[PDB]
Each structure stands twice: as C-alpha cells, then as structure tokens.
C-alpha cells in the first residue's frame, strides 16, 4: 500500500567521549579503535599503517591537537608527515555548551 | 559508439528482515553482522569495539529501541555511552504497509 | 528519552515516467522539467545553457538515448558536443519487468 | 601553525515544524517552501513542475502521508503518477519521544 | 591512450571571509548571499523563506552564533524556530592558528 | 603559490569484466571478491555473512540477475531472503555498445 | 518479477570543453554559465555574487589558473579573496592523452 | 544551550607523500598500503585481489601512470585488465607549486 521508509542511525548520534578517553594516557597516542572516528579515512584503508600522536588536547573546550605518523614500508618505522606542534587542533564531538 | 552506464546495486534491494531475527533472543544483542547494517559507521571502524542492546522491539511496527555499549580501551569492558530506556527508536528496514 | 530519525524522500519513490512521455514528440527534444532528472547536474548549473536531443527511445526497454546541446557563450546558438548516434543509451527510472 | 576545520551547519540542527505547518490545511497541498524540504530532488530541479498532496498526517506520530503530482508538460495540468491512500508515510523530521 | 583526470575545485579552497563580513553589522542578519554557505540547504530549497540572527560572534576565535528564522507561510512573517541564546555557535571557515 | 589539486581514481575507470568471469561457472555463485564490487555494501559490513546466486547471465547485454542469500546466524546455514527469479537484473559496468 | 534499476548520466559524460572555450577572451572572465561546472558551489549558492578571473590557461594541457572575486554585499564591488597570480591551476575536464 | 558542531578530519589534511615513496623501486608496484589511497575502492572489496603497477612517475609533476593488475578467482595469477602504457596517468596528492 504505502511505502515507509526505513532509517540506519548515524554513529555520532549514539556515541560521544570526553578527549581525554580517546588517548593513552602515557603513551600520547590515540588508541586504535578510534582513530577511524577522528580521521576520515578512505575505504579499505589499512589502519595498521598509521598512528595518531596527541600533541595537546583541551578539558575545557573538548579539542584534540593531533599530528599523524605512518608506517614507512621499507623499515616499517612510524615517521612523521613531511613540525614541533599539532598538524591540526579540532573538537572531535558534537557539543552542546557555552 | 554509444555509453551504456553500469549499476551497481543498493544492498537494502536485496536484504531485508523482520526485526526478531536482528538479535540474539537470549542475550538482547544484535548480532554482530547486522551492526553495520543499522548504524552507520565510519569507514575503516573496528566493530569488535562496540555492540548493541536491544531495549525494545516492536514486531507490530518493524522496530527497534537501542543502546550503544562501546569497549573502554584500557579495561576491555563494555560500558555504556555517557540512561534506563533506549537511546533510539527506529524503522531499520524499508516497509510496505498500513 | 529516545532520538526517532525521520527522513526525506527520494524522489525516485515517488516519480516514475514511461519514457515517451519524457519528450516533445515533434522536436525530439527532452522537455525542459525533465533534464535534471536525467543528468546528475553541478549544483547551481544552469539548465537554460543546455538541451537533450532524443536520438532512440525504446517502449520495450524503458530506455533512451540522447545527445547533449550546449549554448554558445558569444553566438546563443546551441551546439552539438565535440557523431551521428547517441552519446549515451540508458534506462532513466527503475523498473520491475522480464 | 595548526589547521583548525570549520563547519557548515546541517539545516536539521536548525530547523524543525509540527506536521500541521507542513501544509495548506484547507487545500491539504504540501505549501511550496517545504516541498524540497520533505523530498530529496535532483540539483536543479524545476519545483514548480511538482506538487505534494497530504492524504493523511498523524499529530500523535509527526507524520505525513504524501502523494505526488506532477505537470504535464503539453496540458499543464497536474497528474498523479502512474492509486486511492498515500504514496509515502513517513516523519518527516527528528524526534524525542515516547 | 591514458586517462588524465580532471577536477572540480572546491569552493573553501577559494573563498574565506573574516565572521565581520558575513553580516549586516547594523541589522545583525547575515546577509543572503552567504545564508547557504553557513547552512547545508537541501536541493532547491528557496532561501527566501529564512534568514540567520546573528546573536554572537567572535573576531579572535572566528565564530558565528545564529539563530534561525524562517517565513510562516499564512502571515508571510518571520518567526523563530520552537530561546534567548544562538542555535548554534560554530566556525564557519578553516582557519590556520593559535 | 598556486593550489594544483590532486585525484584519486575511480575503480571503475581501471576495472571492467565480462559478465562470465564473475562467477564460479559451476557453482553458480559470485566470486567472494566481486561481491562489494556488485553490490554497495554498507560500511564495515561482514561479507562471509552473504553470498550471490546467478540465477540469470547475459553475454550480449553484459547482464547479471542475482538472488542474494545470507547466513543465519544461529544455524550458520545460507538462506534466500524473504521466489523463483532473479531478485535483480543488472548490469555490472559500464558498456560502449550498441 | 525482478528489480531493473535505472540511472541518471554524470554531467561529464556527456560534456567536455576545450579551456578557450571556457571563458570570455578579451575580459578573461568564465563565462557565467561554466563557473557551477568548474567550483563545487554550495546548495542554492547565489552565482551572481561571484565571478573566476582567468589569471592563465594552458591549450597544451588543458588547464586554467583561476582567481575568484566575490561581490562585497554593501558597495556592490568585486573584490578579490584574502595576490599576483592565480589561487589555483588545474585541469576542468577529464582528458585522454600523453 | 547551542549546538557546537564537531569535526572528522580528512585524511587529505594530514597525509602527502613525495611520489617517489608510493611504491616498491625494485618491483614497480604500489606499495599494498598506498592501494586505497590512490584508488576509491568500493566499500569492503578485498584489496588481496588487486596491486597497481607503475608505468611511469613524474618526480617534477608529482604524478603517477598506472596498470591495474588483479588476481584470477581460479588460477589466482595477477592478470592485467582487458595495453603497452599506463591506464592512467594522475597526480595523487594536492600541490602548492608552479
Ligand atoms: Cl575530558
Ligand atoms: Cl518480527
Ligand atoms: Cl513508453
Ligand atoms: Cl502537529
Ligand atoms: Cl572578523
Ligand atoms: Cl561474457
Ligand atoms: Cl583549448
Ligand atoms: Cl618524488
Ligand atoms: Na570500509
Ligand atoms: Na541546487
């Protein structure tokens, strides 16, 4: 009779975390299973080629200052993209505040 | 001579389900291979790290109430986002009906 | 308590044509209500600009094919671009057949 | 030093109406501005070559029951497409609720 | 022989403008050129039936807080959405900064 | 100076195939590795959980009718969804022909 | 019986251009009708509020340097963004060469 | 009290790579975790059964010419697609140059 459409729920509308659940706490990495959340990354990409390094994060705004590492193929040592600071500072999760 | 575009098909022409046979009857969670077919996740995201409870179901409506449980990084425990209800009540199929 | 999604309609759900009635008969033009629904146009284009001949059109297979007409800039005479045929042959909507 | 990503805001986040302000309530016509609002129509499309008629709407449920009619491009008068009830029901925006 | 191909440019990568620029400083409503650079509009929709109160903004962070109000279609006045505050307080470019 | 901006490609303008190397001639089931290539898969989604019966193949028309069958996941036994058909006719890539 | 989706042709199937063609030779501006095809504008954009100012053009690789100037809402002016030369070269249009 | 809208970064804002590093000098072929970042790869396809050679690379336009290679389901050879040069020939990552 009449079509209704159906709805898959977006991921930000279920789950939110203050920053500073999203880091090693000792090592200043994002854990792993997050940083497809804060990267967009493109399809079939392997994660395991790269780390997220926090460099400052922010209680009071709820920003993360990041820099990204990669895994060279050759030594298969993490390096750093092309300097002393974060490469971007961004509030990862919808807020709502003053 | 003349271009004669491909397709390539929307999963949810082919796929479709009532709501009971989403979830585990016994444990209330979804099974682990529909997750990614209800919320919408990030490209490269790493299920193991998130499940789903089912709160409610309704068989009439072709719903579902749920609640996201993410792995706390650090202990490996499933933990609640941020209350007693379900966080969303949706439609996850396209229906055809009154 | 608990987040409901709506959503907006595809158009595709509601709009269904038989491919004759996509075109003036007697010009063998698509008529102008019809070009975006036929080509995935840039946001902002300006359809005035162009014109879709209809080359074929099959009653059997829901197809059509076309050849696309610009609007010279300095002239206003519409112009082919770059043979004789079609430059695409496609089935414009969804259909439920043999 | 660091990049700092901006955002275009989702007009979701900003707009929302009870179903009853969706529609002319003694023409039962879907009123004009809200017309891309509830269908997702092709970039560039020509609205004035289309109408929504309201066959239903629940204030209980925020939903709409739709039919679409469309101009004949030879007559100019509006048709239905391709029976007596809805083409569509559904909600039309986000909700929190029981 | 080999495929080459091209690109379309993205708007941000062209445009920026200071948060005073994006309003009528003596109205405080954004002016209507850049109402669907700030909003994510969906196709089609006639921004002549909104606008956006400007309520706070920032030179040092480059932030905008506005409100949305749109045009009740009996009256053909312009009334807010459901408080005081903004809707939403957000950065409307990329930035690179402190 | 100036921006130059890059491009990734699209699989489709590397890839095409003949609608019988897609699947295995005597089980009649798509090569595991041509499933996402065929259908748009919903992000993350664990493809060992389906499977696509060619029940019809075209070699003029470079066509494919496929039922789509899923795992249970109690019995772990491959069911069809929901006759006798094809649940979609198709073609996989995009064609120069007449 | 079987599902037979259709499809809408991308643009730039069917229209290419050589970059002289692009732009009005002696103001060395796009002409209006090609700046939604070259710049990913915004939904509902205002075209008239910005003009791209030819700065270069290569024949042999088909690419144009371009600099966008945006109308100044109060004194009604063209005014460039934020130098000398253009903000950006690139390729409009898929090319098949050496 | 407002909506503050977060941010998922895109990959292109942190990741460059001189072209030099793409792939393996002795073999010529794209390094395996490089694959998706050249190509948009359908959502779930399984990278195993494809590697991209590289015909040619411009060190002074930072570009790449590549074959597409993939693996036969029953001999599970790497077979090219359908000759002599690459397939195509494009710059993966944004510049700022001459
Ligand atoms: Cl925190
Ligand atoms: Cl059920
Ligand atoms: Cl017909
Ligand atoms: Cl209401
Ligand atoms: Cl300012
Ligand atoms: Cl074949
Ligand atoms: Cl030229
Ligand atoms: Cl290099
Ligand atoms: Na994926
Ligand atoms: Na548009």
Chains 1, 2, 3, 4, 5, 6, 7, 8 share one sequence.
Request: charged share 15%.
């Amino acid at each position: 009779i009449s079509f209704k459409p159906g709805n898959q729920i977006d991921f930000n509308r279920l789950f939110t975390l203050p920053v500073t659940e999203l880091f090693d706490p000792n090592t200043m990495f994002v854990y792993d299973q997050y940083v497809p959340l804060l990267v967009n990354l493109p399809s079939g990409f392997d994660q395991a080629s790269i780390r997220l390094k926090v460099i400052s994060y922010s209680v009071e705004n709820q920003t993360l200052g990041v820099r990204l590492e990669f895994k060279d193929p050759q030594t298969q040592q993490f390096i750093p993209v092309l300097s002393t600071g974060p490469q971007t500072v961004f509030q990862p999760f919808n807020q709502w505040a003053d």
